[PDB]
RNA sequence: CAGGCCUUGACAUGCUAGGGAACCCGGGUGAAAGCCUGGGGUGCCCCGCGAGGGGAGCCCUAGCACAGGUGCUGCAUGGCCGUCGUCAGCUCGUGCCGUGAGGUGUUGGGUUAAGUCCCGCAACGAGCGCAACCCCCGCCGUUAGUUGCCAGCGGUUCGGCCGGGCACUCUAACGGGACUGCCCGCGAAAGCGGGAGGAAGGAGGGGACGACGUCUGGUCAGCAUGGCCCUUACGGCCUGGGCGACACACGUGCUACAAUGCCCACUACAAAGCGAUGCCACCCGGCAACGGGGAGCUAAUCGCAAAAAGGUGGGCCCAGUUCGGAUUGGGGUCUGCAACCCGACCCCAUGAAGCCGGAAUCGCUAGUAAUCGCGGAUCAGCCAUGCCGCGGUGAAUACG
């Protein structure tokens, strides 16, 4: 039962940094702190290193994991 | 209540959802009333002194 | 009971409105 | 038709002061609509008595805002003489509406 | 009738009726008093105190 | 750790507020931070004058600020050289064309805050505590009064273990509302920490 | 906590110096901080015809005096609070008794909620406490009618809507009233037990009030403060994370396990409060949360606001059920820069435990318990089932 509204949020830090990598083919890795940003299509086939709060975790973004947010793939806590 | 945090006054939050009352008298940031700008403690003190017009000891 | 979101009481207790408890 | 509300914290001043406006017209105006009470708006403040913990103590404080009406029907022109600058209260506020 | 609840009112009505019924004929007090309909029930919702869940009902303390 | 403030406990009765004025939920706080800041400067300044009370009245941008002092001299100054500085220094903080009286305390030995300050001073002056207390009560108990009492906190004479010395005379029925007990607290900074002096002076009755 | 950064600072008072005044708009890299940089801009004093020169305020660099620490010590401390405990007790003055610590008073008999009062007494009196003066509730009056009503009577757009009246209700100021005063019985008194009259009867209910002191009680993270300790950092900025973890255990609670009950209709009766950049009537879109538009409020005048339990009618027929609503898929609305971690709120689908709880253990003596709903502080929103108040309905029992 998730939600947000009409305007799908994404931080332009990497947006105008992810598409900017497209107008040149592709790239490899992107160091980010903004896990607040919603994963959109122009990312599919990329590798975004998200931040735990300690380190940057590589995250090969895929087709299905679109509607989700970067943070959902960067587990914060460490357990048994 | 480190001076560095009594900077709250900024009003230059960059995002208004960062603003936060904070007692004007003791810097208190945890039980600050609106109508006084004073925390629950400071309010008790000055109230006793009578430096808060009208504010009397309620009973009933 | 006061804990069933979809009942008259559910809404009242939770102090909300909706299909199961319209605003007059 | 002179409506003048009287709001204050002190029911004695806002009361005497209120009966000041009443006579400063009973010598130059309609019998006036007399001094009307009007419910008081109490504001309560409840705080844990001491600092740190002890959440079961607390002390209760209230700010009682008393009110009044007065109201001088018959816009007497001779009344504003006695009711111009012949006041004395210190914690009272006054609203004038015709 | 106004204020309160229908059962409170029922008792209020009980007063007026006997209070008016007395003004009508003061010789009626002598028969009403023995059953005190002339008395005003002072029992009123007792205030809620702090520290207590509701006036008298106190919180529950664990393995003291 | 009990006992309510004697003043706060007697506001509606034998004892009136030190700030009389109505305000709305939009200005009350402002007319307070300021109203308080007034007491802030006046306290640091008119110290030597020995300021007992600092009433303050307000209206449409008006201000009373009646300052009660034992020695009004230091207040006013040379002819009027000072009561002018501290009024221009005052109205500077708050552009409200503020008045500024200077009442005189008839017998400062019935002014609890003063009596407290007195004892407080003597303590910073390495004096003997018990004496000052006994004296204070006497001075106050002699200048008329139906009762009096003084309480110095702890760490007496720099003594490792804090204590609490007091002594008093006449009556000081803190439980009776219809009394009138000027209360006055005075701190006392030292080389070995703070001390707290408290003063009570049972003046009238009904 | 990790990482990127400032280091005379985010904030005080000052200082000697190269320099440009102030303060306005820019651009690079940036996660943001920062850091590098571009123009706009030459006001104010005393000189000088002028170029310009030296000063004021301000800011800027480099070096100072110093800022800053929610760093340690609540046994170095102030202040405030908790606690025994609203328990009825703790003391003093003078006298008297003891070599003395100390005693007497305060013990004793009656009595009381009470060191409350009476009677006794080498004690006579006092303080601090009890009580009483303060608040709220219960009856009546006086003052006061843009809130009350045909109480009356006159017009109904049948709405106290009109007229106009304050009498009622109420609102809120001020007073009246209760004193064991009156009657009988007991007593020596104080004061019991009964009766009358009264709204109210013997502290009429409920508050605020908590003595000398005791826990080396609590708080250095509210604040204040002595002493230690750090100063390119234990100080400061920021982005992100964590305070929300989960094999487990406990406290306080919420919702239940159902028929005296649960649904859906329709209907009736409260009090307190709150409402500018906020309550939001009404109308329209949507199942709805909510969205549009939009009247009124500056608030006894408008709004929050439906009170709910109750009542009338209908359904369910004893089933894990039309009980219970956990969990989990979906699809949405909002606030907010932003709801992954980690927000409520709708709507569809899911429909878990739970048939009243071992040993133990808690509350409450009357408008109390139990039960029902309403408001507020804080607050963008909210994780409030918390807390502080509010008013409906309204018991059981106390031999001892
Ligand atoms: K129930
Ligand atoms: K201690
Ligand atoms: K289960
Ligand atoms: Mg958005
Ligand atoms: Mg500090
Ligand atoms: Mg906030
Ligand atoms: Mg705050
Ligand atoms: Mg159900
Ligand atoms: Mg109740
Ligand atoms: Mg007192
Ligand atoms: Mg020139
Ligand atoms: Mg301690
Ligand atoms: Mg302490
Ligand atoms: Mg500790
Ligand atoms: Mg003696
Ligand atoms: Mg002997
Ligand atoms: Mg002797
Ligand atoms: Mg003795
Ligand atoms: Mg004895
Ligand atoms: Mg006594
Ligand atoms: Mg009446
Ligand atoms: Mg007798
Ligand atoms: Mg008392
Ligand atoms: Mg300790
Ligand atoms: Mg302890
Ligand atoms: Mg301690
Ligand atoms: Mg926590
Ligand atoms: Mg329950
Ligand atoms: Mg049942
Ligand atoms: Mg609609
Ligand atoms: Mg619709
Ligand atoms: Mg979240
Ligand atoms: Mg069953
Ligand atoms: Mg009891
Ligand atoms: Mg609620
Ligand atoms: Mg809220
Ligand atoms: Mg939650
Ligand atoms: Mg709630
Ligand atoms: Zn404060």
Backbone discontinuities in chain C, residue before each (C to N > 2.5 A): none
Q: What experiment produced this structure?
A: X-ray
Written as six digits, the tokens of F22 are 């109505």
The answer to whether D32 and D11 have CB atoms below 8 angstroms apart is no
| F146 contact to strand G (CB, 7 A limit) | no
Written as six digits, the tokens of A15 are 């947006």
How far apart CA A34 and CA A51 sit, in angstroms, is 8
Which residue's structure tokens are 């590798």?
A: A47
Q: What is the 3-state secondary structure (H, E, C) of C1-24?
A: CCCCCCCHHHHHHCCCCECCECCC
Backbone angles phi, psi at A59, to 5 degrees: -145, 90
Q: What angle do CA F3, B54, F186 make, to 5 degrees?
A: 45
3-class DSSP state of D61: strand
**Quick one: closest CA in F to D6, which residue?**
F22
CA distances to E9, E34, F153 from E20, in Å: 16, 17, 66
Domains of chain A: 1-80 (3.30.860.10)
Exposed, middle or buried, B55 (CB in 10 Å: 0-12/13-18/19+)?
buried
| Selection from F51, F28, F92, F5 nearest residue D91 by Cα | F28
The answer to whether F196 and F153 have CB atoms below 8 angstroms apart is yes
**Quick one: closest CA in B to F16, which residue?**
B50
Domains of chain F: 16-106 (3.30.300.20), 107-206 (3.30.1140.32)
- CA of B30 from ligand 27 middle (Å) equals 14
Ranges of each domain in chain D: 1-98
**Class of domain B1-60 (CATH, top level):** few secondary structures
DSSP string, E9-45: HHHHHHHHHHHHHHHH-GGGHHHHGGGTTTS------
CATH T-level topology, domain D1-98: Alpha-Beta Plaits (3.30.70)
CA distances to C6, E8, E21, E25, E29 from E14, in Å: 43, 10, 11, 17, 14
b/e burial code for range A23-45 (CB count within 10 A of at least 16 → b): eeeeeeebebebbebbbeeebee
Q: Residues F142, F143, F149, F153: is their CA dihedral positive or negative?
A: negative
How far apart CA F113 and CA F92 sit, in angstroms, is 28
| Selection from F115, F114, F159 nearest residue F137 by Cα | F115
| Selection from A28, A67, A75 nearest residue A50 by Cα | A75
- The count of other CB atoms within 10 Å of the CB of residue E27 is 8
- CA of A78 from ligand 27 middle (Å) equals 20
Deposited resolution, Å: 3.0
Nearest nucleotide from residue F178 CA, by C1' atom: G133
The answer to whether D83 and D22 have CB atoms below 8 angstroms apart is no
- The count of other CB atoms within 10 Å of the CB of residue A77 is 6
| Per-residue DSSP letter, C21 | B
3-class DSSP state of F184: strand
Which of E5-14's residues contact partners 24+ apart within 8 Å by CB, and which partners?
E11/E41
Contact F15 B35 (CB under 8 A): no
DSSP string, A22-71: TTTS--S--B---TTSBP-GGGTT-B-BEE-SSSEEP-B--SSS-SSBGG
| Selection from D55, D64, D4 nearest residue D29 by Cα | D4
How far apart CA E19 and CA D24 sit, in angstroms, is 43
- The count of other CB atoms within 10 Å of the CB of residue F106 is 9
H-state helical runs in chain D: 13-16, 18-23, 79-82
**Quick one: closest CA in D to E58, which residue?**
D56
| A29 contact to strand G (CB, 7 A limit) | no
Backbone angles phi, psi at F32, to 5 degrees: -115, -55
Question: Which of B49, B56, B58, B59 should one mutate to test binding to chain F, selecting the residue with the greatest count of F CBs within 10 A?
Answer: B49
Ligand number nearest to the C-alpha of F1: 13
Which residue's structure tokens are 């408290």?
A: F198
Strand G: positions under 7 A of a protein C-beta atom: 1-2, 10-11, 31-33, 67-70, 76-86, 126-139, 143-147, 149, 169-174, 197-200, 204-211, 213-219, 221-227, 235-237, 239-243, 245-247, 250-257, 262-265, 268-277, 282, 287-290, 299-301, 305-309, 323-326, 329-341, 343-348, 351, 361-371, 373-380, 385, 387-394
Ion ligand 8 contact residues with beta carbon within 5 A: C 4
Length of chain D: 98
Helix (H) or strand (E) holding B56: strand B56-57
3-class DSSP state of D30: coil
How far apart CA F35 and CA F16 sit, in angstroms, is 17
Contact B50 F8 (CB under 8 A): yes
Written as six digits, the tokens of C6 are 């979809």
- The count of other CB atoms within 10 Å of the CB of residue F94 is 16
- The count of other CB atoms within 10 Å of the CB of residue F194 is 11
How far apart CA D6 and CA F59 sit, in angstroms, is 14
Question: Which of D59, D89, D90, D91 should one mutate to test binding to chain B, selecting the residue with the greatest count of B CBs within 10 A?
Answer: D59
3-class DSSP state of D94: strand
| Selection from B43, D58, B42, B49 nearest residue F5 by Cα | B49
The answer to whether B23 and D33 have CB atoms below 8 angstroms apart is no
How far apart CA F90 and CA B1 sit, in angstroms, is 28
């Amino acid at each position: 039962p998730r939600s947000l509204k009409k305007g799908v949020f994404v931080d332009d830090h990497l947006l105008e940094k992810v598409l900017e990598l497209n107008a040149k083919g592709e790239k490899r890795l992107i160091k980010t702190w903004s896990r607040r940003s919603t994963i959109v299509p122009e990312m599919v086939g990329h590798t975004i290193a998200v931040y735990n709060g300690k380190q940057h975790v590589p995250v090969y973004i895929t087709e299905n994991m679109v509607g989700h947010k970067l943070g959902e793939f960067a587990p914060t806590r460490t357990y048994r | 209540a480190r001076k560095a945090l009594i900077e709250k006054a900024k009003r230059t939050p960059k995002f208004k959802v960062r603003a936060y009352t904070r007692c004007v008298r003791c810097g208190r940031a945890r039980s600050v009333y609106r109508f006084f700008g004073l925390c629950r403690i400071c309010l008790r003190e000055l109230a006793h002194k009578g430096q808060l017009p009208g504010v009397r000891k309620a009973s009933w | 009971g006061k804990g069933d979101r979809r009942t008259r009481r559910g809404k009242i207790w939770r102090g909300t409105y909706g299909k199961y408890r319209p605003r007059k | 038709k002179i409506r003048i509300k009287l709001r204050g914290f002190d029911h004695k001043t806002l009361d005497a002061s209120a009966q000041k406006i009443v006579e400063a017209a009973r010598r130059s105006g309609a019998q006036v609509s007399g001094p009307i009470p009007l419910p008081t708006r109490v504001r309560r403040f409840t705080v844990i008595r001491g600092p740190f913990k002890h959440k079961d103590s607390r002390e209760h404080f209230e700010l009682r805002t008393h009110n009044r009406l007065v109201d001088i029907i018959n816009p007497n022109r001779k009344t504003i003489e006695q009711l111009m600058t012949l006041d004395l209260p210190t914690g009272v506020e006054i609203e004038i509406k015709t | 009738v106004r204020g309160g609840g229908k059962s409170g009112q029922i008792d209020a009505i009980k007063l007026g009726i006997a209070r008016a019924l007395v003004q009508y004929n003061p010789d009626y007090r002598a028969k009403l008093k023995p059953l005190g309909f002339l008395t005003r029930d002072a029992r009123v919702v007792e205030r809620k105190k702090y520290g207590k869940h509701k006036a008298r009902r106190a919180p529950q303390y664990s393995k003291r | 750790g009990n006992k309510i403030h004697p003043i706060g406990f007697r506001l509606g009765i034998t004892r009136d507020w030190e700030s009389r004025w109505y305000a709305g939920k939009k200005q009350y706080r402002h007319l307070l931070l300021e109203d308080q800041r007034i007491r802030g400067l006046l306290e640091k300044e008119l110290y030597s004058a020995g300021l007992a009370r600092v009433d303050i009245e307000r209206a449409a941008d008006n201000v009373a600020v009646t300052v009660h002092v034992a020695k009004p001299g230091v207040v006013i100054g040379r002819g009027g050289e000072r009561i002018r500085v501290l009024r221009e220094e005052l109205a500077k903080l708050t552009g409200k064309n503020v008045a500024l009286n200077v009442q005189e305390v008839q017998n400062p030995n019935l002014s609890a805050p003063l009596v407290a300050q007195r004892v407080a001073e003597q303590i910073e002056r390495r004096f003997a505590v018990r004496r000052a207390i006994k004296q204070a009560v006497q001075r106050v108990m002699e200048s008329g009064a139906k009762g009096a009492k003084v309480i110095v906190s702890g760490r007496i004479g720099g003594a490792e273990q804090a204590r609490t010395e007091w002594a008093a005379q006449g009556r000081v029925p803190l439980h009776t509302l219809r009394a009138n007990i000027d209360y006055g607290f005075a701190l006392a900074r030292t080389t070995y920490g703070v001390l707290g002096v408290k003063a009570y002076i049972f003046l009238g009755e009904v």
